[PDB]
Amino acid sequence: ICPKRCVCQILSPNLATLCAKKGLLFVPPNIDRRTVELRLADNFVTNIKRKDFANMTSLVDLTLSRNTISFITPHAFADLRNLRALHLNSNRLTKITNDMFSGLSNLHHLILNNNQLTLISSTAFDDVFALEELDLSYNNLETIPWDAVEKMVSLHTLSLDHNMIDNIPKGTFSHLHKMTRLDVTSNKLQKLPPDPLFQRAQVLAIISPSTFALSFGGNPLHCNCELLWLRRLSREDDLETCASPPLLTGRYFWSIPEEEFLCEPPLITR
Amino acid sequence: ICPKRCVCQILSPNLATLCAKKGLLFVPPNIDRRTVELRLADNFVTNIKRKDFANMTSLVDLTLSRNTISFITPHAFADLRNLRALHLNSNRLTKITNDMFSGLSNLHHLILNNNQLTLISSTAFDDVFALEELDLSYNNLETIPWDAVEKMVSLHTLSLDHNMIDNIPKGTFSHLHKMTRLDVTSNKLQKLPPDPLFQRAQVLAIISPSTFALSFGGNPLHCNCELLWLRRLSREDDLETCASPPLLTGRYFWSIPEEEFLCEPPLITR
Ligand SMILES: *[C@@H]1O[C@H](CO)[C@@H](O[C@@H]2O[C@H](CO)[C@@H](O)[C@H](O)[C@H]2NC(C)=O)[C@H](O)[C@H]1NC(C)=O
Ligand SMILES: *[C@@H]1O[C@H](CO)[C@@H](O[C@@H]2O[C@H](CO)[C@@H](O)[C@H](O)[C@H]2NC(C)=O)[C@H](O)[C@H]1NC(C)=O
């Protein structure tokens, strides 16, 4: 049942298959299909085939953390109907196809951090709409399918720090009431959309603790009146820095008074 | 002299310019050119220009660790004649041009780990021939200019783990007598060249400690008689794993007896 290297243990009624730190180069063939937890972390798997995780209906937690995974066969996660958590962090993934995460309705946690992700095809998140956590940190992403993200009502954590994200839609986080943490540090963002969740990121006074936590440091901010709503907020200085206008270039976001966040009236050239 | 954010300190006769964790987006303009140590680590610099480190002749240690650096202007390190240590780890670098590291004769330590390096043009290491440490770990490299490496006699540390290196020349490490550590873990190596330095990686008996330390785990080894020289060595099991022949696929490198490492005689087809 349990592969030679793996230490599969049994606790009624669940079956766990522990194959972490075993120097594996590929996913072991004879893993019991009625396994519930499967740890394949800290190995050297380079690619996944359909035959690996096929037929595993009872699987609820899969861990492929810290591998050399660069490609996974389309429809290899298709039969994981009861999977709730997937760890694909610290690999060599490049793209996110639609066939990759298909049928993962019960998926609540999806982790893709420390990968070299460049593109995420739309509708790739059209089956994981009911997740609660999404970690896409430390990637080469500049855009994500926000439309599929807007359909994630039960989402409470969105990790996006250390990417190259250009901008972010204004209509997002509208019905995402359960959101409690958003990290967009070290991205190439020019501005930020206003939202009541961000109003909930203050420390105010009785005294009150911040119930929402956002991070927007390390961004080429365009310090105009379109960010004035965020400057009016009362938050701790997180070393944020303006990049433009040239007069505000270099000075801290919180070191600049509200009367210096200005915009420019429209005029007609021809 | 010292930039607004930076904390430049003076100890006779050296001048250090400390600008770490200041939320910088670019290298500050007015850094004193007669600085000796310059810490720009933990910021958000995206690209380097010639005007940044130009004219800094007295600089002996430059630290650009953990930035968003993706491109550096050719001949931007040209005038760093007295530079001995360079830290470019944890960035977004892709390529290593010849103009990049030109004239760095006195460079003894070069660190490029945790970058997305794909290619290293030859002759890029034709000026750093007198270095002592080279960290190219955690990159997408498959080949490096070995010819330029062979001219590094005073080299004692070569970090190459977690890449995609295909193979490695047999004539290397010939005159590199000062070599004391080589890490080639998590690479796509099929085999390994024999070397007296590897004979110095044993624990033998009086009792003796290993004076050389090499690591070759996480590699698709081709367990034939061409690796039999390494199997005959007496070393600690580092979870190494064979990938071929198919009969030896999956079994540990050290769990296989020496009599099973076989090769195949030549025959003529036509
Ligand atoms: C997935 O499950 C099926 C059974 O549910 C496995 O067994 C058979 O697969 C062969 C294919 O060569 C079919 O001809 C049989 O009809 C299947 N059996 C039954 C009872 O339907 C199949 O091998 C499993 N596949 C993998 C990749 O594990
Ligand atoms: C590098 O050093 C030179 C001086 O060694 C700096 O000063 C002058 O640069 C201008 C260029 O517009 C020349 O016309 C002058 O002849 C230079 N002065 C001398 C005394 O030669 C130069 O600005 C420095 N460059 C940078 C980028 O810092």
Author numbering:
A (entry chain A), B (entry chain A): 19 to 223, 227 to 291
Passage from the reporting paper:
Type-IIa receptor protein tyrosine phosphatases (RPTPs) and neurexins are the two major presynaptic organizers. In mammals, the type-IIa RPTPs have three members, PTPδ, PTPσ, and LAR. These members possess a large extracellular domain (ECD) consisting of three immunoglobulin-like (Ig) domains and four to eight fibronectin type-III (Fn) domains, followed by a single transmembrane helix and a cytoplasmic domain harboring two protein tyrosine phosphatase (PTP) domains: the first PTP domain is active, while the second domain is inactive. SALM family proteins have five isoforms (SALM1–SALM5). Their ECDs share the same domain organization consisting of a leucine-rich repeat (LRR) domain, an Ig domain and an Fn domain with 35% amino-acid sequence identity. We determined the crystal structures of apo-SALM5 (LRR–Ig), and PTPδ (Ig1–Ig3)–SALM2 (LRR–Ig) and PTPδ (Ig1–Fn1)–SALM5 (LRR–Ig) complexes at 3.08, 3.16, and 4.18 Å resolutions, respectively.
In the apo-SALM5 structure, the electron density of the Ig domain was mostly invisible, probably owing to the structural disorder. The electron densities of the Ig domains of SALM2 and SALM5 became relatively clear upon binding to PTPδ, suggesting that the Ig domains of SALM2 and SALM5 were partly stabilized by the interaction with PTPδ. The LRR domains of SALM2 and SALM5 are composed of eight parallel β-strands flanked by the N- and C-terminal caps. The Ig domains of SALM2 and SALM5 are positioned on the convex surface of the LRR domain and stabilized by a disulfide bond tethering the C-terminal cap and the linker connecting the LRR and Ig domains. Furthermore, in the apo-SALM5 crystal, a similar dimer-like interaction was also observed between two adjacent molecules related by crystallographic symmetry. We therefore tested the possibility of homodimer formation of SALM2 and SALM5 LRR–Ig molecules in solution by size-exclusion chromatography coupled with multi-angle laser light scattering (SEC-MALS). The theoretical molar masses of the monomeric SALM2 and SALM5 LRR–Ig-His6 molecules are 40.2 and 41.2 kDa, whereas the molar masses of the SALM2 and SALM5 LRR–Ig-His6 molecules determined by SEC-MALS are 77.0 and 77.1 kDa, respectively, indicating that both SALM2 and SALM5 form homodimers in solution. To evaluate the importance of the residues involved in hydrogen bonding in the central dimer interface, the N158A and Q134N mutants of SALM5 were analyzed by SEC-MALS. The majorities of the N158A and Q134N mutants behaved as monomers with the determined molar masses of 55.8 and 49.1 kDa, respectively. This result indicates that the hydrogen bonds in the central region of the dimer interface are critical for the dimer formation of SALM5 and also confirms the dimerization property of SALM5 in solution.
